[PDB]
Design a protein around this ligand. Structure first.
Ligand SMILES: O=C(O)[C@@H]1CCCN1C(=O)COP(=O)(O)OP(=O)(O)O
Length: 330
């Protein structure tokens, strides 16, 4: 690289919330209405290189080898303004990013993408940010990204302002190394839906939103204690119920909506069948019909074969849970 050129490249992994983030207290800084708890996936990640050069006049984003539209371009530039303000400089960057996440299959990439960008900028500009400040910076891009700074179990503390809302990793005595998540890729419409817009309609008009608020802290504690004890059934039951409560809130929105399709319900049924046949596992769903199945690694295969009795081989994708957090790479 050139003499006056500052570059950094980072790899960050996606995460799935077991206790859901859903609805914001503050829409501009992305402060959430409640804490969330997630696990960071080994298989799925984003790699992002950022290159700061004084001769650059504006930010450029290249995604999987392709230019992005003026819209995405405008968005990334506003995000980099935050970075520039944080760093006290006026350098623009060329950003080259590669998603190793099944996005076509409906897996979200925003958590890994913003965590990767935050880390790469910190590396490029030698900002020396703490994990806490990295999380805070990622959060500004996407709420769930705040958690992808960390490996294993992580929790996003909601705080009350930009300084206090951020994530931290939970030590679980290496329990994360025993667990896995199976993704059931569900046939969906290819229409353009959005978590940010969905949770906003819900958080604002849901007749069942209060019900969600009145239970989430209890769920959070229950889950955290289940983790302290490596009690899989205890964790599973509460996260499965939390997730369903989240989708319940959408049904109460004005007017109602759902991310779930009949096939999501079919996969749910198979999970309950696996349990009754002494194969512990629990499901959760995000802003779409895909069903994610939490399972102890020893039972991963056995559970998968049950899904493989009905779903296409290509639609059953398993990932382990990675122990380590965001990393700087070449
Ligand atoms: O992952 C989450 O914690 C929640 C729970 C269910 C799925 N989900 C989401 O899709 C959150 O998607 P985000 O891209 O982080 O939303 P923004 O903060 O507006 O950027």
């Amino acid at each position: 690289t050139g003499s006056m050129v500052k570059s950094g490249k980072a790899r960050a992994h996606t995460n799935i919330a077991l206790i859901k983030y859903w609805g914001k207290a503050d829409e501009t800084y992305i402060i959430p209405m409640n804490n969330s708890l997630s696990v960071t996936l080994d298989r799925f990640y984003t790699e992002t290189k950022v290159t700061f050069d004084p001769d650059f006049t504006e930010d450029c984003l290249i995604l999987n080898g392709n230019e992005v539209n003026a819209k995405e371009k405008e968005k990334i530039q506003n995000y980099m303004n935050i970075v520039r303000d944080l760093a006290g400089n006026r350098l623009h960057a060329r950003i080259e990013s590669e998603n190793y996440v099944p996005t076509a299959a409906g897996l979200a990439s925003s958590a890994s993408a913003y965590a990767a960008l935050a880390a790469a900028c910190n590396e490029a500009l030698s900002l020396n940010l703490s994990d806490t400040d990295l999380s805070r910076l990622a959060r500004r891009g996407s709420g769930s990204a705040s958690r992808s700074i960390f490996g294993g179990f992580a929790e996003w503390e909601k705080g009350h302002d930009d300084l206090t809302s951020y994530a931290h990793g939970i030590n679980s005595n290496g329990w994360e190394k025993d667990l896995s998540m199976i993704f059931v890729v569900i046939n969906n419409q290819s229409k353009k839906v959005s978590a940010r817009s969905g949770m906003s309609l819900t958080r604002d008009t849901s007749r069942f939103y209060q019900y969600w608020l009145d239970h989430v802290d209890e769920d959070l504690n229950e889950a955290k204690e289940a983790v302290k004890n490596q009690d899989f059934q205890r964790l599973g039951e509460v996260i499965e119920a939390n997730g369903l409560r989240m989708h319940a809130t959408n049904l109460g929105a004005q007017p109602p909506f759902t991310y779930l399709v009949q096939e999501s319900y079919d996969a749910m049924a198979i999970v309950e069948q696996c349990r009754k046949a002494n194969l512990p596992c629990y499901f959760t769903m995000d802003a779409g019909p895909n069903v994610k199945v939490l399972v102890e690694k020893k039972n991963k295969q056995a559970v998968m074969e049950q899904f493989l009795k009905v779903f296409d081989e290509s639609k059953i994708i398993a990932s382990d849970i990675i122990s380590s957090g965001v990393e700087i790479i070449k």
